[PDB]
Design an enzyme around this catalytic site. Structure first.
Site, mmCIF file in Angstrom:
data_model
loop_
_atom_site.group_PDB
_atom_site.id
_atom_site.type_symbol
_atom_site.label_atom_id
_atom_site.label_comp_id
_atom_site.label_asym_id
_atom_site.label_seq_id
_atom_site.Cartn_x
_atom_site.Cartn_y
_atom_site.Cartn_z
ATOM 1 N N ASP A 167 21.480 17.042 -4.763
ATOM 2 C CA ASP A 167 22.419 15.943 -4.069
ATOM 3 C C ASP A 167 21.999 16.095 -2.639
ATOM 4 O O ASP A 167 22.770 15.428 -1.711
ATOM 5 C CB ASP A 167 24.091 16.466 -4.158
ATOM 6 C CG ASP A 167 24.317 16.530 -5.748
ATOM 7 O OD1 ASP A 167 23.898 15.905 -6.565
ATOM 8 O OD2 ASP A 167 25.120 17.320 -5.871
ATOM 9 N N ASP B 83 29.537 14.209 -7.040
ATOM 10 C CA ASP B 83 28.975 14.864 -8.314
ATOM 11 C C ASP B 83 29.831 15.393 -9.279
ATOM 12 O O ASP B 83 31.013 15.814 -8.984
ATOM 13 C CB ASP B 83 28.040 15.929 -7.961
ATOM 14 C CG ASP B 83 27.149 16.585 -8.730
ATOM 15 O OD1 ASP B 83 26.724 16.095 -9.802
ATOM 16 O OD2 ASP B 83 27.014 17.937 -8.900
ATOM 17 N N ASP C 214 27.720 19.619 -4.613
ATOM 18 C CA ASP C 214 27.453 21.025 -4.438
ATOM 19 C C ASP C 214 26.105 21.352 -4.718
ATOM 20 O O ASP C 214 25.551 22.244 -4.214
ATOM 21 C CB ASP C 214 28.283 21.899 -5.142
ATOM 22 C CG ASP C 214 27.955 22.045 -6.642
ATOM 23 O OD1 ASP C 214 27.599 20.926 -7.033
ATOM 24 O OD2 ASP C 214 27.984 23.055 -7.225
HETATM 25 N N1 LIG Z 1 18.597 25.070 -17.600
HETATM 26 C C1 LIG Z 1 18.483 23.690 -17.959
HETATM 27 N N2 LIG Z 1 17.459 23.625 -18.755
HETATM 28 C C2 LIG Z 1 17.306 22.298 -19.207
HETATM 29 N N3 LIG Z 1 18.179 21.051 -19.143
HETATM 30 C C3 LIG Z 1 19.442 21.420 -18.609
HETATM 31 C C4 LIG Z 1 19.587 22.827 -18.025
HETATM 32 N N4 LIG Z 1 20.817 22.644 -17.209
HETATM 33 C C5 LIG Z 1 21.024 21.327 -17.261
HETATM 34 N N5 LIG Z 1 20.145 20.683 -18.047
HETATM 35 C C6 LIG Z 1 20.387 19.208 -18.580
HETATM 36 O O1 LIG Z 1 19.940 18.339 -17.446
HETATM 37 C C7 LIG Z 1 20.525 17.178 -17.413
HETATM 38 C C8 LIG Z 1 20.741 16.538 -15.673
HETATM 39 O O2 LIG Z 1 21.082 17.901 -15.176
HETATM 40 P P1 LIG Z 1 21.552 17.599 -13.605
HETATM 41 O O3 LIG Z 1 20.587 16.386 -13.013
HETATM 42 O O4 LIG Z 1 21.871 18.796 -12.855
HETATM 43 O O5 LIG Z 1 22.967 17.044 -13.676
HETATM 44 P P2 LIG Z 1 24.354 17.842 -14.376
HETATM 45 O O6 LIG Z 1 23.569 19.129 -14.691
HETATM 46 O O7 LIG Z 1 25.347 17.757 -13.482
HETATM 47 O O8 LIG Z 1 24.390 16.909 -15.723
HETATM 48 C C9 LIG Z 1 21.877 17.244 -18.083
HETATM 49 O O9 LIG Z 1 22.322 16.283 -19.041
HETATM 50 C C10 LIG Z 1 21.742 18.598 -18.686
HETATM 51 O O10 LIG Z 1 21.898 18.558 -20.230
HETATM 52 F F1 ALF Z 2 27.312 16.908 -12.143
HETATM 53 AL AL1 ALF Z 2 25.710 16.556 -11.501
HETATM 54 F F2 ALF Z 2 24.320 16.464 -10.790
HETATM 55 F F3 ALF Z 2 25.423 15.163 -12.119
HETATM 56 F F4 ALF Z 2 25.956 18.440 -10.959
HETATM 57 MG MG LIG Z 3 26.671 20.075 -9.687
#
Ligand SMILES: Nc1ncnc2c1ncn2[C@@H]1O[C@H](COP(=O)(O)OP(=O)(O)O)[C@@H](O)[C@H]1O
Ligand code: ALF
Ligand SMILES: [Mg+2]
Ligand SMILES: CC(C)CCC[C@@H](C)[C@H]1CC[C@H]2[C@@H]3CC=C4C[C@@H](OC(=O)CCC(=O)O)CC[C@]4(C)[C@H]3CC[C@]12C
Ligand SMILES: CC(C)CCC[C@@H](C)[C@H]1CC[C@H]2[C@@H]3CC=C4C[C@@H](OC(=O)CCC(=O)O)CC[C@]4(C)[C@H]3CC[C@]12C
Ligand SMILES: [Mg+2]
Length: 1036
Positions: A745, A422, A741
């Site tokens: 995942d 990740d 983490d």
């Molecule tokens: N609090 C939040 N509210 C809305 N969107 C979010 C928030 N935090 C992260 N994101 C968006 O959600 C998308 C996917 O998040 P995630 O699946 O957790 O992968 P990562 O956070 O590692 O990019 C990201 O492209 C990010 O822009």
């Molecule tokens: F960086 Al990720 F889910 F894609 F925490």
């Molecule tokens: Mg992460």
């Protein structure tokens, strides 16, 4: 698929089974425990399922379950109740009894459960207790003692006692006891870990119908029973739904995410309740309720939906209790290797019988001595050696800060060929840094505003301040790091939920739709004093949110600007808004449907944040890539951000190529298409989004393996997509490891052969492996220690083979002259030397650096077999050379042939052979204990080194010092000192020869094997694909 088989009770058949399998022999018991279907068929007759009193479960694996009765009868399989559904004449899992009832049904149950109905349902669902049985110590001893191995050991004890070898029998008993006690320690420790993990004993009041209440123990709860939650909060005893109120809960135990999560009351509707769809409305079991408050009504109410093992915590605990079988078999051809040893053992036994016949030994004694020889080749300490190896590996990992729930996965850890990472929070820091916000002026972006505090009060500033899920916890906001930094950047202070301007009217959050990684966006409904109508703000993936916005609001420059900020390594989310013509009030605003709000927005700006690579990530990734372990990044973030982070963390070295695989959906009039657009700065990687991965999987299964083999960056992956990718990789015979983490995942960590979660507690349930350090350094440690564990287990097996064959050779040489080893010599050899050394070999730690060469997988491989045979040739040469050298001495006096051992002890032949063999055991132990490339050198194992030194000094004393233990061991004294020094010289010659032979083999054998019979190919699918791609690259 599953099937049942009912056998109604019959005592005559049971007693017939008992008498047959008890009087006949134990072999029927052996084959029954090997093939239990015959045992059950013999024990009792197949019968009608309704009349079934015992069931056989196929999944083939056969399990036997008793059909218990409580009017109501059920049966527990793997902790899952199945009750006797009378109407359908079948056993349906209790998980499905209340399944499908609508949200309105839960709100109807809201009031409570009738006490009579409560006791009627407690029998059906059972007590709300995830119970790990606490077996009594005698029960555990029964569990281990009944092993056929210990049965053979007891047979050996009896055989040796019958022959008046009391000390050897005591030695066998002590070694078997040590093995049994170590197994007890292992099992008890694992059970204690699980039990302490799933402790719960508390009293929770229940909203009993009629408006009254009742304080009941947490084990009395049943689905439909109503929970009233404590305002200050407390541990949640069972899965439940929030009928009314809001709850802040810490789901770290269930998912490992320490950030408090917001829980809201269940929305009334005529649709089935679902813990997955309504995950945000359902409290889980084992999670901590930080603090919950009731919007309406004196107290917060919840309704239990799943109890016992039905809960998600119960599901995870059940999966731990009954883990999926490990498909990899670490020691290939184990049966064939033990057969290649048994052929030698049988040849030697035949030779022993022949010689004993030749010496005219009575048939009563010939069979006894051949049986003794048979018992020799079975090492009493083998189980102890294996269990100690596993215990040492687990202890080393725990000391490093890595905790494994299934120790069998440690060996898998060393066989990793691909690791999925990740991005956010694993390769990059958890914390963010707001680099600014890009406002829009009509349909064009404006210059970046590094300080959002200076934004004029308007849609963008309110969106920044208000579009999040922060919660004040003990006068300190908590929530997503992105939300925290975004709100902090605006200077607005959190105080439904209201915000105070930095110094411009405070704004209330009428309604809020939380963030879902699958949706990768999040929105709120907002109103402030003087507002004509509430505004809804959305914050999500820049490309997804731009899809919801009106096409005339998104600039034609959007893609280029988003890539300008994204290709620089930033983490960008877009903010969009739309006025909601509803009257501003919680009444209407709280009833909005998410889809009604998400669509038809008006892009407000881009929030650019700076997430940095962890300092420890680049060295770890470069170490992994140095040893030809594929490093793959699976993230939900932008593709350009992911690629930049991969280039920065070494997954894509600067010289190497990178091609973005983009797939177009099969729009009307054309099929799906794959277009490869390379991006300028093994040797060629691929990058592709999540939708592109789905399109490839659905529409290009032919090219999917070629994408997976050389695909390195998997961006915009949803959690289900991550799990699917892990499974697809495993379909290529990859040994996939996953190091993530977050809670998104969980599926990948479950599916991966080796799943590691970084920031965890002393122990957890989320993934097989859990670490305490925040860096990905645990991955190299896990791989190194797994390679060390594999090498250690192979070395222990090799030593036990060598240890046995040596004792076999010694006893054969002594039989050839009508004498045996001796009563106390056997004890010395088996206990003082061999057990000590075998249990101390495994304590040596792993090598400090990963190497390209993988540990061997086959026990029968030509290297191992050649090593064993050459070692045994040297051992036999040394023993026979000593034996024939003592015959040449003038003072030699041949043993008394007539009287048979132990009557003819002491004698020169036994003395010499015992001395040489006793030295040879230590010599072989030192020879097999290879340090590099998978382990630390021998001398770093101070216990093992000290054991070798002390035992060698004691044996040299026996050889040299007259009278030292020469009575107790029944050793004949050798007056000549030159011959003593000659024995020591022979021992030293063997000590040098074993090491030189091992080095010569380990160096010049692989080259000869390659130059002789090079492998045409490898059965691994991914290796075949790699070679094919090298022959012809798939993207031209
Ligand atoms: N609090 C939040 N509210 C809305 N969107 C979010 C928030 N935090 C992260 N994101 C968006 O959600 C998308 C996917 O998040 P995630 O699946 O957790 O992968 P990562 O956070 O590692 O990019 C990201 O492209 C990010 O822009
Ligand atoms: F960086 Al990720 F889910 F894609 F925490
Ligand atoms: Mg992460
Ligand atoms: C007659 C004499 C000469 C025989 C000597 C035999 C001993 C060297 C063997 C027998 C069993 C062995 C023990 C079996 C297994 C372990 C477990 C290990 O402890 C732990 O794993 C706990 C660490 C944690 O809490 O994580 C320490 C070594 C020890 C006790 C071994 C130490 C060496 C022992 C005592
Ligand atoms: C016949 C007489 C005169 C001599 C008998 C010698 C044995 C009783 C001695 C020789 C070496 C001794 C071993 C030397 C080293 C140790 C290590 C010790 O365990 C540890 O060191 C763990 C320490 C840690 O984990 O920090 C267990 C006992 C043991 C095997 C000793 C057990 C008893 C042994 C086998
Ligand atoms: Mg995230």
């Amino acid at each position: 698929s599953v099937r049942l088989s009912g056998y109604c009770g019959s005592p005559w058949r049971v007693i017939g089974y008992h008498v047959v399998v008890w009087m006949m022999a134990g072999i029927p018991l052996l084959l029954f425990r090997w093939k239990p279907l015959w045992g059950v068929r013999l024990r009792l007759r197949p019968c009608n399922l309704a009349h079934a009193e015992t069931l056989v479960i196929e999944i083939w694996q056969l399990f036997t379950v008793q059909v218990q009765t409580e009017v109501l009868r059920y049966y527990l399989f793997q902790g899952q109740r199945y009750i006797w559904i009378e109407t359908q004449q079948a056993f349906y899992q209790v998980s499905l009894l209340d399944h499908g009832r609508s949200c309105d049904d839960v709100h109807r149950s809201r009031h409570g459960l009738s006490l009579q109905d409560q006791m009627v349902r407690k029998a059906i669902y059972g007590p709300n207790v995830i119970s790990i049985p606490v077996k009594s110590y005698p029960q555990l001893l029964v569990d281990e003692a009944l092993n056929p191995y210990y049965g053979f050991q007891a047979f050996s004890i009896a055989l040796w006692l019958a022959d008046h070898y009391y000390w050897y029998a005591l030695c066998i008993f002590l070694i078997s006891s040590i093995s049994i006690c170590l197994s007890l320690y292992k099992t008890r420790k694992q059970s204690q870990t699980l039990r302490d993990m799933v402790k719960l004993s508390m009293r929770v009041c229940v909203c009993r119908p009629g408006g009254e209440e009742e304080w009941v123990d947490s084990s009395e709860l049943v689905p439909g029973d109503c929970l009233v939650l404590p305002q200050e909060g407390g541990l949640m005893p069972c899965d439940a739904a929030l009928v009314a109120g809001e709850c802040m809960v810490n789901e770290s135990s269930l998912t490992g995410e320490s950030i408090p999560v917001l829980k809201t009351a269940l929305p009334e509707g005529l649709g089935p309740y679902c813990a997955e769809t309504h995950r945000r409305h359902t409290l889980f079991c084992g999670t901590l309720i930080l603090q919950a408050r009731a919007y309406v009504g004196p107290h917060v109410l919840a309704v239990v939906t799943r109890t016992g093992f039905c809960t998600a915590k119960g599901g995870l605990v059940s999966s731990i209790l009954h883990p999926r079988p490990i498909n990899f078999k670490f020691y290939k051809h184990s049966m064939k290797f033990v057969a290649a040893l048994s052929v030698l053992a049988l040849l030697g036994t035949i030779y022993s019988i022949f010689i004993l016949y030749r010496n005219r030994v009575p048939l009563n004694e010939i069979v006894i001595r051949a049986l003794d020889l048979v018992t020799v080749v079975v090492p009493p300490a083998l189980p102890a050696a294996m269990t100690v190896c596993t215990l040492y590996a687990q202890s080393r990992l725990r000391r490093q800060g890595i905790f494994c729930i299934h120790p069998l996965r440690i060996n898998l850890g060393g066989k990793l060929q691909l690791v999925c990472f990740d991005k956010t929070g694993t390769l990059t820091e958890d914390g963010l840094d707001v680099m600014g916000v890009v406002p829009l002026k009509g349909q064009a972006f404006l210059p970046l505003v590094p300080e959002p505090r200076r934004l004029p009060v308007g849609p963008l500033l309110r969106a920044l301040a208000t579009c999040h899920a922060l919660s004040r916890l003990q006068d300190t906001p908590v929530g997503d790091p992105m939300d925290l930094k975004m709100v902090e950047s605006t200077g607005w202070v959190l105080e439904d939920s209201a915000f105070g301007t930095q110094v411009p009217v405070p704004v209330s959050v009428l309604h809020r739709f939380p963030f879902s990684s699958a949706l990768q966006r999040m929105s709120v409904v907002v109103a402030w004093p003087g507002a004509t109508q509430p505004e809804a703000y959305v914050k999500g993936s820049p490309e997804l949110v731009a899809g919801l916005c009106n096409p005339e609001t998104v600039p034609t420059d959007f893609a280029q600007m988003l890539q300008s900020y994204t290709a620089a390594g930033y983490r960008v989310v877009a903010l969009a808004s739309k006025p909601l013509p509803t009257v501003p009030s919680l009444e209407a605003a709280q009833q909005l449907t998410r889809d009604t709000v998400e669509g038809d927005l008006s892009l407000l700006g881009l929030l650019v944040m700076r997430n940095l690579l962890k300092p420890q990530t680049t060295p770890v990734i470069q170490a992994l890539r140095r040893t030809r372990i594929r490093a793959v990044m699976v993230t939900g973030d932008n593709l350009q951000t992911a690629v930049t982070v991969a280039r920065g963390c070494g997954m894509v070295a600067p010289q190497e190529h990178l091609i973005i695989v983009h797939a177009t959906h099969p729009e009307r009039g054309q099929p799906a298409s794959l277009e490869f657009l390379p991006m300028e700065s093994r040797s060629r990687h691929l990058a592709l989004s999540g939708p592109t991965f789905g399109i490839i999987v659905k529409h290009f299964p032919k090219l999917l393996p070629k994408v997976l083999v050389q695909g390195t960056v998997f961006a915009r992956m949803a959690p289900e997509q991550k799990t699917e990718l892990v499974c697809e990789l495993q379909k290529l015979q990859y040994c996939v490891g996953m190091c993530g983490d977050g809670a998104n995942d969980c599926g990948a960590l479950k599916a991966a052969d080796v799943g590691i979660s970084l920031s965890q507690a002393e122990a957890s349930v989320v993934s097989p492996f859990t670490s305490s350090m925040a860096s990905i350094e645990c991955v190299p440690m896990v791989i190194r220690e797994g390679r060390c564990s594999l090498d250690t287990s192979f070395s222990v097996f090799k030593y036990m083979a060598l240890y046995s064959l040596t004792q076999f050779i010694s006893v054969l040489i002594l039989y050839t002259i009508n004498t045996n080893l001796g009563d106390l010599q056997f004890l010395a050899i088996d206990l003082v030397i061999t057990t000590t050394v075998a249990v101390l070999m495994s304590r040596t730690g792993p090598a400090l650096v990963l190497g390209r060469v993988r540990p061997p997988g086959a026990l029968l491989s030509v290297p191992v077999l050649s090593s064993l045979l050459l070692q045994m040739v040297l051992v036999t040469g040394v023993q026979l050379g000593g034996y024939f050298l003592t015959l040449a001495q003038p003072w030699f006096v041949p043993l008394n042939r007539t009287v048979a051992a132990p009557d003819n002890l002491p004698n020169y032949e036994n003395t010499v052979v015992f001395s040489l063999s006793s030295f040879q055991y230590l010599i072989l132990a030192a020879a097999v204990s290879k340090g590099a490339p998978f382990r630390r050198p021998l001398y770093t194992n101070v216990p093992f080194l000290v054991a070798l030194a002390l035992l060698s000094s004691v044996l040299v004393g026996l050889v040299l010092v007259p009278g030292l233990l020469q009575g107790p061991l029944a050793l004949r004294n050798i007056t000549d000192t030159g011959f003593k020094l000659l024995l020591l010289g022979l021992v030293t010659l063997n000590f040098v020869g074993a090491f030189m032979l091992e080095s010569v083999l380990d160096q010049c054998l692989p080259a000869c094997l390659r130059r002789l019979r090079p492998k045409r190919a490898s059965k691994k699918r991914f290796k075949q694909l790699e070679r094919e791609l090298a022959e012809q690259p798939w993207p031209p």
